[PDB]
Subunit: 119 residues, 4 copies
């Protein structure tokens, strides 16, 4: 399932627990950017997905403040879990930095991450 | 400032509490889409923003399953809160539906929602 | 309807001609960013839209090189034209800067621009 | 360089010519979606890129109307060309469908395509 440790193509680490209620909790350690150590993540997933070979929709957020650094930014990942023996979480993400109003047009980066489950 | 009841340009209702250390917890009621009533949301926000006039970064997720319906999809909103006389949350969002691998290319809608505390 | 001079919420000026068979050709002058004066744009639009009240899909690209400056970046706008008494072009855009491979993760900004023919 | 034939992970075909003036022209054949045969594309690229090992920024548009079908939609790809012997064009894209105003919130799909040059 979703619960476990995952790594993406950048070398970031995603440790997550999926709760019976649809909750995602855990920590994220980013390999790049204005980040060090682990950050809290929270999110949600479809706890009763279709079983017709569709992925399980999910998303989560990290605000890039922990007890060692603050980037004044937040990323959300939106995507789907694809189960089986080579499980993947395939995502697109939005990274919004706090900006002044004049600079809001350049506040948000977009990208895509693929996570592979370890073990 | 983030804590409260917010409404976007579609008429959706976003009820949220900002916990002191960065949690966002609340409910979302979508006015459009395959949705009815309230859905659980969780997210995070910068609980110590910059003091230079910059907004407060945040994000949250809704999985579109509740006791009424399950759309087999999830939306994340990423944005910033802008305080002031008319506080606003300006976001972009990603709505991913569960799909087959083959159809993953058409799994994700993108858009932008603006929230204020002004009731329609 | 698409042909004309448009302005977005940032004050940028988008001057475009819609050719009969789907071409968009014009210039873009950005009011923000690493840009000055006009830049060439090209794009495409649906030259036979649906007749059910739907907007007209379109998109265009600017590479941010002209005789004045080169930002080593390019923006694409994807959206729809909505005709009517106050015609509008509603878009989302992707601004990709050239980066190293390692830094590609932070290469692309996303946003949304609304255009009308109303001069600021 | 950019001029040539490219294929992406979906099996789509991108035939492009890069002009000295920064123009991109060519045709696109989509392997998926509401599409058949070739469609016109136009775009732009940075004709004087940095040479410090950065990619070359570019973008292009296809409106999904040709003389055999009309999807009432348009895709833009924004990305960068990475030269060398295994040249790539790495993109993110936005596919906007014409909708009614009430349905505009669901008008736009986002994704990512990687193109590999043939030959
Ligand atoms: O630079 C910042 O504002 C904080 C760190 C951001 C890292 C981003 S989140 C999206 C992408 N995926 C990763 O694992 N790292 C980058
Ligand atoms: O149709 C679905 O899959 C679930 C409902 C989706 C509603 C979307 S979330 C983004 C946008 N903002 C809203 O308030 N509603 C729509
Ligand atoms: O800074 C750059 O790399 C070039 C100028 C970018 C301006 C961007 S394009 C998207 C948005 N809409 C505008 O009118 N201006 C900004
Ligand atoms: O379905 C449509 O509206 C027209 C065809 C869209 C195909 C899309 S464009 C983005 C992605 N990359 C491809 O090569 N095909 C899909």
């Amino acid at each position: 399932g979703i619960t476990g440790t995952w790594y993406n193509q950048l070398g970031s680490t995603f440790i997550v627990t999926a709760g019976a209620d649809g909750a995602l909790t855990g920590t994220y350690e980013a390999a790049v950017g204005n980040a060090e150590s682990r950050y809290v993540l929270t999110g949600r997933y479809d706890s009763a997905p279709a079983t017709d070979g569709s992925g399980t929709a999910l998303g989560w957020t990290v605000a890039w403040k922990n007890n060692y650094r603050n980037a004044h930014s937040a990323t959300t990942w939106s995507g789907q879990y694809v189960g089986g023996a080579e499980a993947r979480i395939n995502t697109q993400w939005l990274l919004t930095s706090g900006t002044t109003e004049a600079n809001a047009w350049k506040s948000t980066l977009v990208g895509h991450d693929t996570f592979t489950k370890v073990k």
